[PDB]
Design a protein around this ligand. Structure first.
Ligand SMILES: CCCCCNC(=O)[C@H]1N[C@H](CO)[C@H](O)[C@@H]1O
Ligand SMILES: [Zn+2]
Length: 989
């Protein structure tokens, strides 16, 4: 395996180094406003060296944005695809690319058979070419890598099953900045090429000047270069026709033939397109070819890509007519006139990349290598798109909850083949597709209209219910003796109990276990652990009585703690007399289940302790405000201010109290300048302190917490014996033009360096740049962020993607919510005034790192410790909890998976998914194995997934989508290196 710590890759362009060297000066470049007046040598082209031009018609279809998925499908997309089918069938030399398989699948299944066969004919002959073939064109900032793979898999599985094609070229023209997680996944899924568009105007200018817009994009840690994927960055401001023919939009607009006649579109540069005729074709051709040759100067080959399309284009048959026939007139003229030294035709994306490859094999070009990312994007001046890292944070949090529920439901149900009457496959397909849809660059991003966000939320709620039904059926089957198991697939054997979604302060919907000395003294509960190692985790349930004790199914006592149930309502807490929280440590096998029993008694049982409660304000105890110190277990000691906010952490009895201060601050909106909206973050200066309360302290043997009711945030620090958990109930209410930030202040001498993650996959080094505005120094925090000096690190792990930074040495900060009264002129046509209360969850890990092997200061990556990685796993993939619904469970087993191997801590079974229905004579199960890289600080069984299930006939290493066999495995054993992701399919008789 490559060493990803001591060894630093050699790349031509390393993006952290580029940003340090770039001035980012917003100079007027002329007609190419953000570039320069391109010149070419007309003698470059001659009879011996021609320019080969591919005009690639396309239509950007958003799966929800201003309208819902179903609204756009009925009003726009079904007409685009019906016209594409008719026009490509009738016109064999016309071409069209299609990216969004969500829409293509919705359309194709509604076709009559004649039209399905006509559609297969234009795919088979290459006229209609799928690009990427994901369910959507996902966001790349907020999206988890697992959900990027899920939606890619959903689309590509659909294309393999129904069209027998697998795209190897990716098309991502609209996500708001770009992540190297995409080439990472694509290159492990058989891709050869990808295209991106929305990168910072300054980065486009800098790369254009060096002809570095085409590059072999490798991961920041990849010394060898085996992760590299050929990437094409488009050079101009937009993917629309005015910004895709060449550098002058006033000219390119005259070759968007929809912007004349009856269509109701026009050129804002005030020169209309004109119909191509014998009278004007020579002049129109010279104007267009001059644009193409200028654009060609930015690239290394004689093969040129000219996208032809825009949002929901090709909707009318007349639009197909005017674009096709006018371009045909131009091509017929250009190709017949030797003086241009051009061959021009309609083509596809793969056609372009194949031609570029051929030019490279011919010796025309050597491409540069690149690592890093393209965040944070700005399309003009200081308009950085760091707002959508936080917009609609309720749905951002919901994404991570549904991520986990899909994984758990697929895994729990994979262990068996299910009768079709159980409808396991239908519910898992529904859950996968609703989650996949939400990866769209107007879903998770929080950049859709309010009714479209409600449609995404309703879809995800239906997906969560679908996962609940599969999980509970699966648990009942796994833990009931087969001699007894006689299922009713409409029956609820278990109810799920989720402590963190939506959160009792957001939705008071947790089931209270009703116990009673008469009629029901005991209740069975069951924990699931989706991770492939033994896990101990505190769990809690609501119980109707405080007199409750816990056992396993062998009736061994389990130490427990009863806490009161508190709610927040000046802001003050109130205690429940209707319910109590029973808290105990669950021990669960790898990818397994464990059963416990809750039993009532008439008085305090032997093995249950009772938390004390102290209410501080300027039996429950009362007190004036004061600094407090707490320690749970062998865990750290935390000190809190008089306002209930952390002020210091003491890791061990013999270590110092290290200052770590939590603060809540607010950003505002500019009175005179551009206004923040769903996309843009345009703060009116540095954040100002929130004006501050009642402090609730609950002290227990197993769990303690400090909660404070602040304006807009109920802030809670929970201690269970290691890194604390932070929970913020965030209610921005009617605070128009406000963004609430949570900030950490320390003495860690981090200077201008900090680390944030990409897609939950990798940590990337960031440098704060005082030459850029505040909003440019905000990056996505999809799962964590850290700062460190020579001795000390602080890591904040998140249960939801938010925006954040380090705006000074020793600080971290992360945005909680934002309420914007104004539109930011990117097409949404509304601000963000539909906030609702959201429960955000974090872990806070202070560590000594002076005995850790860290990368050299030139390495562009950072790595978590064991502690911080487990903390993140605790947030994203907690134990699942099941309450048995009926009074008696005959044939109950105490455990499932006690024989499963407990894999090394850096290895995860990200995906387990049965790929075949019960009717298949050969059953197949797919696994995705991810190995992270953890820092070695001087602090298990081999996992062979092909042997997890019996009667294995075959073990294959596959692409991550499971669609191609890469390697038949010896002895049917599944081997993976640090920072590598591998997929395996096991086949069974
Ligand atoms: C500014 C009005 C014209 C909008 C053109 N369309 C876009 O800018 C695309 N980006 C949007 C992001 O929300 C949306 O996905 C659309 O596909
Ligand atoms: Zn879009």
């Amino acid at each position: 395996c490559q060493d990803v710590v001591q060894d630093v890759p050699n790349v031509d362009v390393q993006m952290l180094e580029l940003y340090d060297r770039m001035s980012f000066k917003d100079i007027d470049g002329g007609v190419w406003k953000q570039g320069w007046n391109i010149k070419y040598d007309p003698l470059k082209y001659n009879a011996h060296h021609k320019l080969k031009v591919f005009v690639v018609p396309h239509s950007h279809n958003d799966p929800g944005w201003i309208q819902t998925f179903e609204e756009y499908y009925q009003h726009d997309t079904k007409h685009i695809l019906s016209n594409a089918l008719r026009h490509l069938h009738d016109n064999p030399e016309m071409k069209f690319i299609w990216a969004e398989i969500s829409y293509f699948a919705r359309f194709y299944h509604d076709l009559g058979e004649n039209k399905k066969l006509q559609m297969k004919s234009i795919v088979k002959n290459g006229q209609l070419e799928f690009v990427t073939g994901g369910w959507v064109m996902p966001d790349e900032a907020n999206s988890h890598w697992r959900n990027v793979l899920l939606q890619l898999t959903e689309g590509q599985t659909w294309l393999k099953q129904f069209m027998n094609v697998t795209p190897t070229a990716s098309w991502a023209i609209d996500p708001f900045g770009h992540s190297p997680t995409m080439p990472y996944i694509l290159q492990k899924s058989g891709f050869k090429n990808m295209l991106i568009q929305r990168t910072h105007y300054s980065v486009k200018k800098e790369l254009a000047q060096q002809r570095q817009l085409e590059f072999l994009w490798r991961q920041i840690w990849d010394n060898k270069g085996d992760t590299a994927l050929f990437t094409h960055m488009m050079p101009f401001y937009s993917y629309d026709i005015p910004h895709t023919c060449g550098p002058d939009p006033k000219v390119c607009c005259q070759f968007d033939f929809k912007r004349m006649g009856s269509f109701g579109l026009s050129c804002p540069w005030k020169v209309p397109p004109r119909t191509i005729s014998d009278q004007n074709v020579a002049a129109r051709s010279d104007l267009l070819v001059d644009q193409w040759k200028k654009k060609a100067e930015l690239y290394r080959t004689n093969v040129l890509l000219i996208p032809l399309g825009d949002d929901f284009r090709f909707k009318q048959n007349t639009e197909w007519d005017v674009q096709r026939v006018n371009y045909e007139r131009l091509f017929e003229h250009i190709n017949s006139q030797a003086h241009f030294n051009v061959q021009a035709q309609f083509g596809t994306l793969q056609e372009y990349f194949d031609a570029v490859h051929q030019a490279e094999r011919a010796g025309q070009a050597e491409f540069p290598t690149l690592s890093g990312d393209f965040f944070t994007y700005a399309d003009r001046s200081d308009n950085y798109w760091s707002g959508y890292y936080t917009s609609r944070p309720y749905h951002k949090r919901m994404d991570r909850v549904l991520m986990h529920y899909v994984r758990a439901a697929e895994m729990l149900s994979a262990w068996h083949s299910w009768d079709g009457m159980a409808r396991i496959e239908e519910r898992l397909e529904q859950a996968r597709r609703e989650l996949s849809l939400f990866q769209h660059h107007d879903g998770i991003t929080g950049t859709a209209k309010t009714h479209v966000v409600v449609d995404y939320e309703q879809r995800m709620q239906e997906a969560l219910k679908a996962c609940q039904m599969v999980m509970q059926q699966s648990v009942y089957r796994l833990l009931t003796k087969p001699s007894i198991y006689s299922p009713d697939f409409s029956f609820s054997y278990f109810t799920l109990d989720d402590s963190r979604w939506p959160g009792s302060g957001v939705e008071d919907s947790r089931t209270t276990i009703i116990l009673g000395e008469d009629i029901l003294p005991s209740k069975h509960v069951v924990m699931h652990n989706t991770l492939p190692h033994w896990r101990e985790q505190l769990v809690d349930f609501y119980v109707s009585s405080p007199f409750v004790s816990v056992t396993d199914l062998a009736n061994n006592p389990v130490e427990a703690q009863v806490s009161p149930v508190w709610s927040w309502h000046t802001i003050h807490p109130q205690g429940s007399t209707t319910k109590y929280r029973i808290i105990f440590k669950a021990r669960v096998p790898p990818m397994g289940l464990a059963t416990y029993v809750l039993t009532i008694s008439d008085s305090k049982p032997e093995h249950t302790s009772y938390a004390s409660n102290l209410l501080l304000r300027k039996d429950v105890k009362f007190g004036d405000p004061r600094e407090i110190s707490l320690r749970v277990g062998n865990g750290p000691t935390l000190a809190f201010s008089e306002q209930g906010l952390l002020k210091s952490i003491q890791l061990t009895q013999d270590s110092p109290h290290v200052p770590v201060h939590f603060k809540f601050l607010k950003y505002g909106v500019r009175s005179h300048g551009d206004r923040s909206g769903a996309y843009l973050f345009l703060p009116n200066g540095p954040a100002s302190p929130v004006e501050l309360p009642v402090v609730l302290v609950t002290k227990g043997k197993l769990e303690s917490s400090v909660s404070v009711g602040l304006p807009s945030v109920v802030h809670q620090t929970i201690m269970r014996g290691g890194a604390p958990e932070i929970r913020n109930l965030v209610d921005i209410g009617s605070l128009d033009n406000t963004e609430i930030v949570m900030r950490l202040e320390t003495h860690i001498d981090s200077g201008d360096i900090f680390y944030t993650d990409l897609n939950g996959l990798q940590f990337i080094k960031r440098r704060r740049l005082d030459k850029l505005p505040l909003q440019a120094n905000y990056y996505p925090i999809p799962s964590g962020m850290f700062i460190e000096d020579a001795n000390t690190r602080l890591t904040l792990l998140t249960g939801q993607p938010l925006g954040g930074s380090s705006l000074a040495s020793g600080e971290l900060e992360i945005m909680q919510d934002r309420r914007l009264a104004s539109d930011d002129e990117r097409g949404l046509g509304q601000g963000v005034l539909d906030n609702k209360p959201v429960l955000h969850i974090y872990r806070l890990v202070l560590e000594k790192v002076n005995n850790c092997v860290r990368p050299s200061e030139l390495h562009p990556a950072g790595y978590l410790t064991s502690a911080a990685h487990k903390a993140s796993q605790s947030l994203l993939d907690p134990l699942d909890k099941f309450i048995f619904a009926e009074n008696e469970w005959i044939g109950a087993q105490g455990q499932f998976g006690g024989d499963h191997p407990s894999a090394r801590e850096d290895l995860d079974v990200s995906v387990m998914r049965r790929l075949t229905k019960s009717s298949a004579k050969t059953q197949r199960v797919g696994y995705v194995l991810h190995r992270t890289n953890l820092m070695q600080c001087g602090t298990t069984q081999k996992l062979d997934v092909c042997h997890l299930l019996p009667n294995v006939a075959r073990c294959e290493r596959t692409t991550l989508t499971f669609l191609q066999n890469l390697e038949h495995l010896d002895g049917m054993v599944a081997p993976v290196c640090p920072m590598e992701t591998a997929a395996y399919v096991s086949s069974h008789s």
